Design a protein around this nucleic acid. Structure first.
Lengths: 106, 99
DNA sequence: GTTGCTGACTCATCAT
DNA sequence: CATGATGAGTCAGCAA
């Protein structure tokens, strides 16, 4: 059946579907809005449906970025531990080469 | 009445001692209010541990980052000296073979 | 029935 | 006004 937002919109004789109110690009939304004669109650409901529809996408995107950022940090730690080990190994071979050259030269 | 802190730390049994003069719906609403304050703490505690884990990961990363950069800088600075010494070392061996 | 989590939505801000 | 990011709070639904 009709969601609460759809019922509210039709109760105020809003001609647009809710999917259109939320997902229309800003440019098409403004031009469509400019061809109508809405009163204050109708305008406020349209904006409320669009704002909430867009913000809940922003909220779930923000939660997913937190999880992804943790994976990146753990990947960063994994690579840094490998880089430190690689540099320690390189420093070790260079240390052994320099020690022997100084030893052969007494 | 009761404050937010007094209610959230109250056990279920201790809440049964604060029902003097309350309706059946008032008791249900008081317990539901306690559950809401509990959920506010669960959410805040859930966010504290996520921030704690993130700041701890970023602390180890920054420590290893400056550790790796110092290692890479000192290794390059020393490789230059080893190449110069080896270059002069091979020139002496080459000169010795002339003799 | 309660507890502890957590995804989802909403409001209130901050920024462009 | 439009837009998006984000902490705090709220509710719903889950497993224990």
């Amino acid at each position: 059946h009709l969601t609460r937002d759809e019922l509210r919109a039709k109760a105020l004789h809003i001609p647009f579907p809710v999917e259109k109110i939320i997902n229309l690009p800003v440019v098409d939304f403004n031009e469509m809005m400019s061809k109508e004669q809405f009163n204050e109650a109708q305008l406020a409901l349209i904006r409320d449906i669009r704002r909430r529809g867009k913000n809940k996408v922003a909220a779930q995107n923000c939660r997913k970025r937190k999880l992804e950022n943790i994976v990146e940090l753990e990947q960063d730690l994994d690579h840094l531990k490998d880089e430190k080990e690689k540099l320690l190994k390189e420093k070790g071979e260079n240390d052994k080469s320099l020690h022997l050259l100084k030893k052969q030269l007494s | 009445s009761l404050t937010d802190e007094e209610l959230v730390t109250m056990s279920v049994r201790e809440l049964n001692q604060h029902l003097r003069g309350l309706s059946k719906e008032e008791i249900v609403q008081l317990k539901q209010r306690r559950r809401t304050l509990k959920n506010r703490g669960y959410a805040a505690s859930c966010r504290v541990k996520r921030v704690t884990q993130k700041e701890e990961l970023e602390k180890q990363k920054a420590e290893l980052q400056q550790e790796v950069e110092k290692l890479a800088s000192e290794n390059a600075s020393m490789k230059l000296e080893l190449d110069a010494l080896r270059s002069k070392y091979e020139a002496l061996q080459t000169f010795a073979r002339t003799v």
